[PDB]
Amino acid sequence: GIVNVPNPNNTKFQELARFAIQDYNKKQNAHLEFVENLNVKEQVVAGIMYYITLAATDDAGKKKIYKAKIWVKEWEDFKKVVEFKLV
C-alpha cells in the first residue's frame, strides 16, 4: 500500500522535510540547506509513514541527497523522524 504522492514538492511535504532536517541539524550538530523533495511515498502505519528522498546542501551549492522516514499523526500534529541518511 505504498502509494507515491503525486505532488512530492508541495508545501506540506516540504514542511515535513524541513522538520526532518531541523531534527538532524540539532541531532548530529550540523546545518544543512533544505534544497527540496525528489520523491515522497506513503504507507498507513499507525498513522502514516512517509518515506522522502529529499535534497540538501553543504557550503554554497555543494549538494547531497538524503532519505528520511517520518511517522506522522497529523490529527495530532505529531511527526517523528524515524531515520535519515545520505545516499
Instruction: Name the experimental technique.
Output: X-ray
CATH entry, 1-87, from 2.40.40.20, 1.25.40.10, 3.10.450.10, 3.40.50.970: 3.10.450.10
C-alpha distances out from residue 51 to 22, 24, 68, 84, Å = 17, 16, 6, 10
Q: How many residues does the chain have?
A: 87
CB 84 within 8 A of CB 66: yes
Grouping H, G, I as helix, E, B as strand and the rest as coil, residue 59 is coil
Residues 84, 70, 19: CA angle, nearest 5 degrees: 80
Strand partners, 52: 40, 68
* Grid cell of 62 as nine digits: 555543494
Short-list 26, 87, 34, CA closest to 57: 34
| Residue boundaries of the structural domains of the chain | 1-87
Instruction: Compute the distance between CA of residue 36 and CA of residue 11 in angstroms, rounded to an integer.
Output: 10
